[PDB]
Amino acid sequence: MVMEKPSPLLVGREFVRQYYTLLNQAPDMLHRFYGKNSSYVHGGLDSNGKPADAVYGQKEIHRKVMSQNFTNCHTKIRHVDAHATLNDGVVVQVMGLLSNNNQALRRFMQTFVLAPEGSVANKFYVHNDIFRYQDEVF
Amino acid sequence: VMEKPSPLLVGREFVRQYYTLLNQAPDMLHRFYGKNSSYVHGDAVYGQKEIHRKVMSQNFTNCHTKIRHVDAHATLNDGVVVQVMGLLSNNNQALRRFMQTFVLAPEGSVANKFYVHNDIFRYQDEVFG
Amino acid sequence: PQYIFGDFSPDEFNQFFV
Amino acid sequence: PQYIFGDFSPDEFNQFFV
């Protein structure tokens, strides 16, 4: 009954659909993916012309998501690649289009790291979430 | 809490070394990787010998990089995950916007020393067609 | 939905992810 | 480089990284 480690690509494509399903349906609940040492960034520019910084931990991630204005978010996933990494982790690379409150779709580049939770089988958490729009950066 | 290195400083140091070498000697790129490293430049190849061949088949000539942003964070088991957003021009063809994802794992012995456990590259133009 | 990705009770999962 | 990456001798290091 001893198993193989789960397929990285399948793990990655099912997480990415859950992630973007929740962002549209109840983004007050995105915080549930994240742990104590989880990094999060979702685009943004500062006072200078310069990309905005990461926040750390559940409660900081939650208020950060809340302060963004996720209303009837629409997503198109153009690219998903996933590979085993350290400690039976999965690294996921995503490129797509995102629109908030039915404004224009903007192109994006994202990287996730999923860590085993270790409790049940097939149970993961998001250790890292790096999301950047292409316009704010290029 | 062991005075872990700064992930950003580790990130920016690896990124200068990588693109410096990609330009100056792409032959030597395989020296970043271990036996269980995965590599994609748009099916994955694993380990130094297979990665070296993949490198060579992509003729890296007078290869010019423009990095626009770099994000590095600490990940599982003392790793650093790095997303790069840049432009690449190979043999003075038109600069093409790319995304690259790196995972950097500690060698376990030597201090301040890392190898590349994951390398994923993708041109954005191939994806938004 | 073969994989679980955060802290969710059973219904929360079958509200959002089935 | 206070930080080493991959498998290089100090001689190769000087030629490329400094």
Numbering used by the authors:
A (entry chain A): 1 to 138
B (entry chain D): 2 to 43, 53 to 139
C (entry chain H), D (entry chain E): 6 to 23
Task: Give verbatim excerpts from the published study on this entry.
G3BP1/2 are paralogous proteins that promote stress granule formation in response to cellular stresses, including viral infection. Most of these interactions occur in a mutually exclusive manner via a common binding pocket in G3BP1/2 NTF2L.
For instance, caprin 1 and USP10 show mutually exclusive binding to NTF2L, with antagonistic effects on SG formation. To determine whether these interactors compete with the N protein for binding to NTF2L, we synthesized three peptides derived from the G3BP1-interacting motifs of caprin 1 (aas 361–381), USP10 (aas 1–25), and nsP3 (aas 449–473) from SFV. However, the primary aa sequences of G3BP1-interacting motifs vary considerably and lack a conserved motif. Similar to SARS-CoV-2 N protein and consistent with published structures, both peptides inserted one phenylalanine (F372 in caprin 1, F10 in USP10) into the same NTF2L pocket. Indeed, after overlaying the structures of all NTF2L-interacting peptides, we found that the side chain of the inserted phenylalanines of different peptides adopted a nearly identical conformation. In caprin 1, USP10, and SFV-nsP3, we observed that aas around the key phenylalanine residue were in close proximity to a side of the NTF2L pocket made up of G3BP1 F33 and surrounding aas.
